[PDB]
Design a protein around this ligand. Structure first.
Ligand SMILES: CC(C)(COP(=O)(O)OP(=O)(O)OC[C@H]1O[C@@H](n2cnc3c(N)ncnc32)[C@H](O)[C@@H]1OP(=O)(O)O)[C@@H](O)C(=O)NCCC(=O)NCCS
Ligand SMILES: Nc1ncnc2c1ncn2[C@@H]1O[C@H](CSCC[C@H](NC(=O)/C=C/C2C=CC(O)C=C2)C(=O)O)[C@@H](O)[C@H]1O
Length: 212
């Protein structure tokens, strides 16, 4: 899988893939998960946090989107700040060095064991790769509570920001995850991800830091 960084500065280069992306999200979230609340008239699954400040990581395999991740700066409106503030006791995280992760998916074809590293593992490793590249110290996540043992198992250190709550019938919690060398090297080692997978097409102006 090839993981493309898509952001404000190179969005123009990815118009076609982004069109396909918002459609895939309809299938994954509205159709498969049955999250009818996210349905929209034109059939795209796009919400209030799909803005120019968002960063997408899109995994592409044999011309198809097979995995995805959305990242929103915590200085911008987030799911935590604007939709689920009650999940963080002290208040929303609003830090220049923290991003909120959302809309993680792998298409059915790439779930579980196939070729080498699991797509699930590659997209999450790519998230940490991005964070380390731009010098983030944390990722926030509003997530279903079944993620918690998975985050432990892949080597991440996720601290809860509050108590779990039932949202839309299911237990949900907000966490803050450390972004550091161990977080990335950890998943890579535990999941057989061969280090860097990110593409930075048209992003030559953006400085990043050497990966460990
Ligand atoms: C979450 C996801 C990336 C996991 O992919 P994967 O780990 O490669 O493969 P699977 O889907 O088989 O999931 C493996 C395990 O994760 C857990 N899991 C995955 N989806 C789950 C759900 N909706 N509810 C509860 N547990 C779930 C289960 O323990 C599952 O094993 P089991 O079904 O044998 O019990 C994938 O299922 C997906 O893309 N789902 C739709 C998007 C989504 O729900 N994302 C979170 C909200 S943004
Ligand atoms: N705009 C939105 N308004 C209102 N509601 C919304 C909006 N959007 C989504 N909901 C709803 O949020 C609920 C709880 S789930 C919390 C949000 C969820 N993200 C993760 O799980 C991240 C995992 C994750 C990410 C990275 C990882 O590495 C591991 C797990 C998501 O992006 O949909 C669901 O019932 C949705 O219907």
């Amino acid at each position: 899988m090839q993981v493309h960084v898509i952001r404000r500065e190179n969005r123009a280069l990815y118009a076609g893939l982004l069109e396909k992306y918002f459609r895939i999200r309809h299938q994954i979230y509205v159709v498969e998960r049955g999250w009818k609340e996210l349905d929209r008239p034109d059939g795209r699954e796009i919400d209030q946090f799909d803005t120019e400040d968002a960063v997408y990581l899109l995994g592409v395999d044999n011309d198809d989107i097979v995995a995805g991740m959305r990242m929103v700066p915590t200085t911008s409106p987030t799911l935590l700040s604007d939709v689920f503030p009650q999940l963080a006791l002290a208040g929303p995280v609003r830090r220049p060095d923290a991003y909120e992760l959302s809309r993680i998916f792998v298409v059915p074809r790439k779930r579980g064991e196939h070729g080498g590293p699991r797509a699930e593992a590659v997209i999450q490793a790519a998230a940490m790769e991005y964070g380390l590249s731009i010098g983030l110290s944390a990722f926030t996540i509003v997530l279903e509570t079944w993620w918690l043992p998975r985050l432990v198992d892949q080597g991440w250190k996720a601290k809860p920001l509050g108590l779990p709550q039932d949202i839309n019938g299911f237990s949900t919690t907000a966490v803050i995850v450390d972004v550091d060398d161990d977080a990335w090297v950890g998943i890579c080692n535990r999941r057989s991800v061969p280090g860097p997978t990110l593409e930075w097409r048209g992003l030559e102006a953006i400085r990043r830091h050497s990966l460990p």
